[PDB]
From a paper:
[name] has two structurally and functionally distinct domains: the anti-MinCD domain and the topological specificity domain (TSD). In contrast, the anti-MinCD domain of EcMinE (residues 1–31) interacts with MinD and induces the dissociation of the MinCD complex, thereby blocking the inhibitory action of MinC on cell division. Remarkably, we found that the N-terminal region of the TSD (residues 19–26), which was previously defined as part of the anti-MinCD domain, forms a β-strand (βA) that participates in TSD folding, and HpMinE forms a dimer through the interaction of anti-parallel βA-strands.
Two monomers were observed in an asymmetric unit; they formed a homodimeric α/β structure with an upper surface (the α-face) consisting of α-helix and a lower surface (the β-face) consisting of an anti-parallel twisted β-sheet. The extensive hydrophobic dimer interface subsumed about 1100 Å2 of surface area (22.8% of the total surface area), and size exclusion chromatography showed that HpMinE forms a stable dimer in solution (data not shown). Each monomer is composed of a long helix αA (residues 35–50) and a three-stranded anti-parallel β-sheet comprised of βA (residues 19–26), βB (residues 54–59) and βC (residues 67–74). The N-terminus of HpMinE (residues 1–12 in MolA; residues 1–15 in MolB) was disordered and invisible within the crystal structure. Within the crystal packing, HpMinE forms the spiral structure with 12 protomers per turn generated by the sixfold symmetry. To further analyse the dimer–dimer interaction observed in the crystal structure of native HpMinE, we compared the crystal structures of HpMinE crystallized in two different space groups. Native and Se-Met-labelled crystals of HpMinE were crystallized in the P64 and P65 space groups respectively. The conformation of the dimer was well conserved in the two crystal forms, but the dimer–dimer interaction began to deviate in the tetramer formation, and the packing was tilted about 24° in hexamers.
Author numbering:
A (entry chain A): 13 to 60, 64 to 76
B (entry chain B): 16 to 60, 65 to 77
Amino acid sequence: AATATDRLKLILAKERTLNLPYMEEMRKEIIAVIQKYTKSSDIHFKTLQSVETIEVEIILP
Amino acid sequence: ATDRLKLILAKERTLNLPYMEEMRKEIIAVIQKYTKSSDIHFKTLSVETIEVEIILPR
């Protein structure tokens, strides 16, 4: 319903064309930081215009 | 013209998160650690969203 379970959402957008070989490493660390301050353990992260959005859904404790 | 990056951290504005703004700080740090970007813009806008637009330097 419109009440139980607190979520947090993180989006990382970039040029689909762009290189950046560390995106992964960055993803991992970014998530690591969130878990640190939110103590969350339920984390969902998927990838997909021509913009690419690493989407990350985080359920708070 | 310029290669940008953008990040959104969204939450329900009601919800009380003492640590927001710390996460923001830290998270930016990580991004800088990896992008080395000297240019960063963050603003806060039912749903509170923290947006960080980042300009890559390389």
